[PDB]
């Protein structure tokens, strides 16, 4: 029921690595500060997304056993998880508590980002669903690690090698759900359920970005490698 000494060690190691990310307040303060044009918001996104991929590669490299995996499978895992990890981090940021009225302004600022309305509706639906689960910092960290170490990614040669690495993280998360939310025994299942909804952002990600109301869709060389753009 309770975490074993090895599980407490793994949890703290994942947490320390996860906290190397850009602070949510840094992101929300920028968006809440001024009302930006669609052109300025596109550049804010590319810079934010480039920082996120850089930090995500560093977090991924620290996941126990990742460096022992096949080099081609390592690339496949990173490319397969980058977009999902970005939406999971955006959901964490969106659900962080702000002074009264600020989360309403943040929502409105995201609606006026420059992208098509058809892509906005599913994002908020996912963020509000993530928010109702009242996830702790440890739950977001483990869920990101679980997303990265998904053995069911396309172009994976050794699925069992990936499964062996994801298994101890799923075990720790299951114990945390039972401890943090004993009132809701469906909590772990709900978290695994959100992981299946996260995957919907993959297929139409390039279409969403190219729908931005800008003259030139300039992406960084790193974003071109991880996204299906340029």
């Amino acid at each position: 029921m309770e975490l074993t000494p090895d599980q407490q060690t793994l949890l703290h190691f994942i947490m320390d690595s996860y906290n190397k990310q850009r602070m949510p307040q840094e992101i929300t303060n920028k968006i809440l500060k001024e009302a930006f044009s669609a052109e300025e918001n596109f550049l804010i996104l590319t810079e934010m997304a480039t920082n996120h991929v850089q930090v995500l590669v560093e977090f991924t490299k620290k996941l126990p056993g990742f460096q022992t995996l096949d080099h081609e499978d390592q690339i496949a895992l990173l490319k397969g998880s980058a977009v999902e990890a970005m939406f999971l981090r955006s959901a964490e940021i969106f659900n962080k508590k702000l002074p009264s009225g600020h989360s309403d302004l943040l929502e409105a600022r995201i609606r006026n980002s420059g992208i098509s309305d058809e892509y906005i509706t599913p994002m908020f639906s996912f963020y509000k669903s993530i928010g109702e689960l009242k996830m702790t910092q440890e739950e977001y960290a483990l869920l990101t690690a679980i997303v990265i170490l998904s053995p069911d990614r396309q172009y994976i040669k050794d699925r069992e090698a990936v499964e062996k690495l994801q298994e101890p993280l799923l075990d720790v998360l299951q114990k945390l759900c039972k401890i943090h939310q004993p009132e809701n025994p469906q909590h772990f299942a709900c978290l695994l359920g959100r992981l299946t909804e996260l995957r919907t952002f993959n297929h139409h990600h390039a279409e969403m970005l190219m729908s931005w109301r800008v003259n030139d869709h300039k992406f960084t060389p790193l974003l071109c490698e991880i996204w299906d753009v340029q």
Binding site: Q54, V57, T60, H71, I75, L78, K79, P221, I226
Partner: peptide, 11 residues
């Protein structure tokens, strides 16, 4: 193809 990702991983 994924030269930058391979570089960041192998660094």
């Amino acid at each position: 193809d994924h030269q930058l990702l391979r570089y960041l991983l192998d660094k």
